[PDB]
Design a protein around this ligand. Structure first.
Ligand SMILES: Nc1nc2c(ncn2[C@@H]2O[C@H](COP(=O)(O)OP(=O)(O)O)[C@@H](O)[C@H]2O)c(=O)[nH]1
Ligand code: ALF
Ligand SMILES: [Mg+2]
Lengths: 317, 128
């Protein structure tokens, strides 16, 4: 029992619980054929919760539905309780089927930056047929895409060959940041995560406020904490595969006007992103490790964590 | 007994139904500092059955300041949209003001805390 405590940190939905699950895959318990069935209920609710949100936007932004009977279908969807869901109806399938292909709702999804929408929404809704199949088993890729918030703090222990890494899963909202206090004891590493996609979005806990300016200032304060100067800080610029989607239309120059680099480059933009985060360090003697990651990609995760496993073991041993 | 307990695995309402178990799951939610959500629901379960307008406008200010208000002691984890919603109804409060987040918070436990409780060792050693 050689133990080292690690901390997974980041602003609301930078992809923390996704790592916890990824670690359970590569070096952990694994997700067998039976266990995948437990998720089913949520995957549904996620699509419901994914959809419900887009209906409120039709009220909010004032975008009109093209086919007027789609309003009655969305009205049926509005009144379905997200909690009590257990099996998937054909009508609710058709209700969801219909509205997704509605071009007004497709226009409502173009502007998902203007309100709250789980980014795994386009993942679930283009393969509805597979899901709405009564004998549907969720793949391993489907479980990663699930949108299940983490409230409070959690210890998920994993035993690697040479060492037992104790990871700390935590809640990434301002409301849950008061709790983080109870685990800062005995720390060897922080794994700070930042959603590369969330550069144009606004936070969940408030209005008219940019998420990366949240992630920047938050990151900044974690460093400054003096019980962490004898602990290795690792940055993780997550959701890089979404950044490639996002960068193509939304311009980073409309949000961080300093950027001298070129628009429409998934690389050139992210190489400036890491510079803003790594420009927030007071301590010159302390060094900042950084990896780019696609948290829902198990092969990309297995190379970053192996290179990081070697990074940490060389430090404290 | 070890059967009353094994009955709770079935669904999340079976765990709420028993009295002993309601104190232990709290003792576990405490052990993951996410008890503010369980106490809130029972604040809503006692709120939903409240009758007189006097008790409806005063109890409504107890729970808000606790779980909702910005930098509230037991601030449950929820959005700004549901917090804006419940911020306009408290004046002339009614049984179905909070339910917006009550159901969110129940979902927050069924999909996160409760499953972990069934994998917990304190639960499983109770099941023999
Ligand atoms: N496309 C993409 N989606 C991701 C990635 N990481 C996480 N997600 C999704 O974003 C959501 C948030 O993940 P989570 O780990 O809960 O972040 P947390 O809220 O900070 O714990 C989940 O629904 C994931 O499916 C990524 O690298 N790429
Ligand atoms: F935003 Al989180 F776990 F940090 F859902
Ligand atoms: Mg999480």
């Amino acid at each position: 029992r050689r133990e080292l405590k690690l901390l997974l940190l980041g602003t609301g939905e930078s992809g923390k619980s996704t790592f916890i699950k990824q670690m359970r895959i590569i070096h952990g318990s694994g997700y067998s054929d039976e266990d995948k069935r437990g998720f089913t209920k949520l995957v549904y609710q996620n699509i419901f919760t994914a959809m419900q949100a887009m209906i409120r936007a039709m009220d909010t932004l004032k975008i009109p539905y093209k086919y007027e009977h789609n309003k009655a279908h969305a009205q049926l969807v509005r009144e379905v309780d997200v909690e009590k869901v257990s099996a998937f109806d054909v009508p609710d399938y058709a209700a969801i089927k219909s509205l997704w292909n509605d071009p007004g709702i497709q226009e409502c999804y173009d502007r998902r930056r203007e309100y709250q929408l789980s980014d795994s929404t386009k993942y679930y809704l283009n393969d509805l047929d597979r899901v709405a199949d009564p004998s549907y088993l969720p793949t391993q890729q489907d479980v990663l895409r699930v949108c299940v918030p983490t409230t409070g703090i959690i210890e998920y222990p994993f035993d690697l060959q040479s060492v037992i890494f104790r990871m700390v899963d935590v809640g990434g909202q301002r409301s849950e940041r008061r709790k983080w206090i109870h685990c800062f004891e005995n720390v060897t590493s922080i794994m700070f995560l930042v959603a590369l996609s969330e550069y144009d979005q606004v936070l969940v806990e408030s209005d008219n406020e940019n998420r990366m300016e949240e992630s920047k200032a938050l990151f900044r304060t974690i460093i400054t904490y003096p019980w962490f100067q004898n602990s290795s800080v690792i940055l993780f610029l997550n959701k890089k595969d979404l950044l490639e989607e996002k960068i193509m239309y939304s311009h980073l120059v409309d949000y961080f006007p300093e950027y001298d680099g070129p628009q429409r480059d998934a690389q050139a933009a992210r190489e400036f992103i890491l510079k803003m985060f790594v420009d927030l360090n007071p301590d010159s003697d302390k060094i900042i490790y950084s990896h780019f990651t696609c948290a829902t990609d198990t092969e990309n995760i297995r190379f970053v964590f192996a290179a990081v496993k070697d990074t940490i073991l060389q430090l404290n041993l | 007994s070890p059967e009353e307990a094994q009955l709770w695995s079935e669904a999340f309402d079976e765990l709420l139904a028993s009295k002993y178990g309601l104190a232990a799951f709290r003792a576990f939610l405490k052990s993951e500092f996410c008890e503010e959500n369980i106490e809130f629901w029972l604040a809503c379960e006692d709120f939903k059955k409240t009758k007189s307008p006097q008790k409806l406008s005063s109890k409504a200010r107890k729970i808000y300041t606790d779980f909702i208000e910005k930098e509230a002691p037991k601030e449950i984890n929820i959005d700004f949209q549901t917090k804006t919603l419940i911020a306009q109804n408290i004046q002339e409060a009614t049984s179905g003001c909070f339910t917006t987040a009550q159901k969110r918070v129940y979902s927050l436990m069924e999909n996160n805390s409760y499953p972990r409780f069934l994998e917990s060792e304190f639960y499983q050693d109770l099941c023999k």
